[PDB]
DNA sequence: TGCACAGGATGTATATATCTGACACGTGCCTGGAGACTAGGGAGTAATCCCCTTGGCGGTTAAAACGCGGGGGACAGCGCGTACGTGCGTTTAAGCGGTGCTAGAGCTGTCTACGACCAATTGAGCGGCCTCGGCACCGGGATTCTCCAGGGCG
């Protein structure tokens, strides 16, 4: 994750990215800092709570 | 003449009177033993609330666990020599017996500052709160920093 994310900041290397739901939890500190437009979450029925 | 002896002239442990030191016994003045009054500090209870558990499925991750190569560092063997171990004679100085002192250690009245004990005020310090600027974590990039392969050199 580290070697994905040394591309990751200055310039634009991706349209889209591709991350689990359990993994936003550890590194919600660092996908908070870059700006995002479109979060779409798969089968809802998970964040329910 | 060469020799044994009878008694004095010195030693020497042996037995007796004598000199410290420590245990043992008989007192009387600062201690304990005990009796009564006060009272606030300790034993006991009625909520309480508040964080701390109960029991176990799965999914996933970061940390724990195992496995091999070998490189270098622990470690055994062994020779050296000088640095203390051991043994003499020669000296300086403490141990100890005894002395003349004193100046500071040590027990006791005076009173007098001066701190113990107790009402009245409050304000400075403690419970409660709610923010934002310093802090947490990481990318970007330059910088250093060590690892490995010649090769010019033995």
Redesign the pocket.
Known sequence: ??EK???????DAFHVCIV?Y??VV??Q??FK?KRWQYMVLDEAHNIKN
């Not at 994310?5 to 310039?11: A, D, E, H, L, Y």
């Open positions: 994750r580290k994310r040394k591309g990751w900041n200055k310039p689990s359990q993994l550890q590194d500190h660092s800092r």
